């Protein structure tokens, strides 16, 4: 009610970029949390639960590909981009043989933890290859920060 | 409260008229239109519009209707395909079976493959007639 | 201690349905949270952390299959089932060749976020294909809502 | 700020063991949480959010392998190790054929839930095969407990 | 400091409470000094395997059909389900708790040096011309 | 507004505190105006690479053996581990931070149009009789 809070979701309309939105049902940006330059900006020193989900998808495996998902902190106290939470996925171990069916695949990734953050710290939630993100339905791609 | 109205959040005394589909609750009635790329499909008192869905190209889907302010995107399949619902909401477009070495007993439908029977010598596996 | 709270787990004894239970060690249903018709029902307006895990399993890949996991809100303010959190998995890209070993596979999915909910809102946590769920051990399948 | 809190991360320097650390940037051990014998020890009765992530990796698939990740409670009220949260992964369904490229694979697992815990309860976060853990970068392997 | 078999009442350092026996759980703590602890029997599909003061019984485990396991003993109120393998199989423990049933090696082109055991495959040796890899005798 | 190289004390808008040098971390803020900042050296296996007021040192990264990486420089107190590839390999960046070591192409039945670089494979071209498909020269006929 008074606690700074964000639960933002991906723009479905822009392809090949991961742009976060707040003005939607079951999304939140309140009590000081700010969304600036696609980053969530903490209004106050404190402990925050920080989390993000992405869903990647593809049509068969013409190529080997690595997918990454990373929540980063750009801290006032340390002016470099630094991983808070990170993961990697490898959806396509063997290439689909020439002529065979290109069967759809899906790879979700969840990241989540509690962090001491400082007023003005910038958090970003990013993937290396947005072309693979799945924006078909709600609740598949999101990024949240909540003050505990 | 009567049908079509709701109890004001900060006052049990007051009944408020719900927002019409296509709109959302800006304030307890102050209903505003859903912005591009969002919608509401029922009468509501919801603080923001829902995000539109998008057709699944990976499932071979095609768009029948784009998102409007009161209707979510509508997706389907092409000619000679049917929808296989993996779930309530997820479906995949597959090609209708041709019932080779057999006979089309019932033609392909929107959400249902062709029903084949097989000629002497064959039986059905993966809805294809095999020896 | 006073905060509404649920951490429910799957019934091991019913196969081919995902039925939630509270009366077990390390499970919770307290302070107003209600479990009715397999849905968690919120006692009060507020911010809630909402989450669920499922573990799917199978014995080789006789067929292509897609597995889904979805946490939904049926809100008093909007009487339609709406995705809060959702994901998809594709365990079986190529079929196991005829005669080859049917090696076990496992697919966990985690979903989690913070949401503003209203008194009377119904939350459900569901999969499309419960036959594939892994009930062998504790802590593999669960569904939680906690008021922050 | 006053709430017991831990967000601990893996020692990069010891290979083939999962040893947790607190004295690093974006890690936490505060307000009564203790880290003893690689286990997080709760200072007070209450509700805690408990979570862990691991990232496993390998170089091709010379062998079938199952990877597990488990958060356990050793409770004062029940002196056995018991699963709170658990999952399994199967990265290598088919062996890499003799002569073919050994392509890297990655498997993240996230586990997370809310639990009523008691003063003195010991929580551990473990995998069966630490040789496969990915310690290359920050944010890939972690274990957290926070009092709500 | 309460004696063996008892525990400190959560809301009163003065009172010691007797623990519940395996097969039961804590419905309620002693209401006061010298009073009985209210322990109730575990409901079907749950258990407790040690003396405890736990507010609910643990969920029984289930044999892993995907691992080829079979049930030796069903869950009782004081004992978790017990699972194992079939004739001519051994358990390979992937972890403390997860195990997979595999077929014992026959040591073809070789010799059974030590027979298959519950948790351990046959130990082979190999005839001239062969050596061991994946505990099968292959050509050298 | 504190001057360059200094920061506002978290618990007191009145006090400006001098930042810690790379190689060190903030053990403790100035206790008061004009006072020294307590910066201590990063322990083994950690580092800081810029001036900071951070409460702990960052964890060093580790070379990715699964990517074929090799260590160029071990972690020092002011510099993270530096990783690269071997002779006749290049780095393919899957992301800002993740990269995989691959072998440089030899452009057989062709010519090296641009030589292998640190972060980029050899660019091949073909001459008469062949054409280029995925950086390899295939016969036209
Ligand atoms: C499984 C499969 O290969 N489906 C084919 C597709 O590849 C092809 O381009 C087209 C022909 O009509 O549509 C489907 O029949
Ligand atoms: C055996 C026969 O009478 N006719 C053909 C056969 O040569 C063909 O390969 C098969 C494929 O399913 O379909 C049958 O109609
Ligand atoms: C991996 C493998 O070959 N498993 C075999 C199974 O296919 C066979 O039918 C039976 C023999 O009795 O049980 C196992 O030995
Ligand atoms: C993908 C691939 O085959 N890489 C090769 C490896 O097999 C070979 O033995 C060695 C020679 O330098 O290293 C790489 O060139
Ligand atoms: C096809 C041709 O004219 N010349 C050679 C051929 O002998 C060789 O086996 C192959 C290797 O890529 O291609 C060319 O180098």
Numbering used by the authors:
A (entry chain B), C (entry chain C), D (entry chain A): 10 to 157
B (entry chain D): 15 to 42, 50 to 152
E (entry chain F): 14 to 153
F (entry chain E): 14 to 154
Sentences copied from the publication:
TNF, like most members of the TNF superfamily (TNFSF) exists mainly as a trimer with a threefold symmetry resulting in three identical receptor binding sites. The mechanism by which TNF induces signalling across the membrane is poorly understood, however, it is generally believed that the process involves receptor clustering.
In order to further understand the impact of our compounds on receptor binding, we have crystallised mTNF with and without compound (UCB-4433) in complex with a truncated form of hTNFR1 (residues 41–184). All attempts to crystallise the complex made with a more complete receptor (residues 41–201) failed as did attempts to crystallise a complex of human TNF with humanTNFR1 regardless of the receptor length. In order to highlight the degree of distortion of the, arbitrarily defined, A–C receptor binding site, the UCB-4433 bound mTNF–hTNFR1 structure was compared with the complex without compound by aligning them through monomer C. There were no structural clashes within the long-form receptor dimer and only a minor clash between receptor and TNF suggesting that such a complex could form with only very minor changes in the receptor.
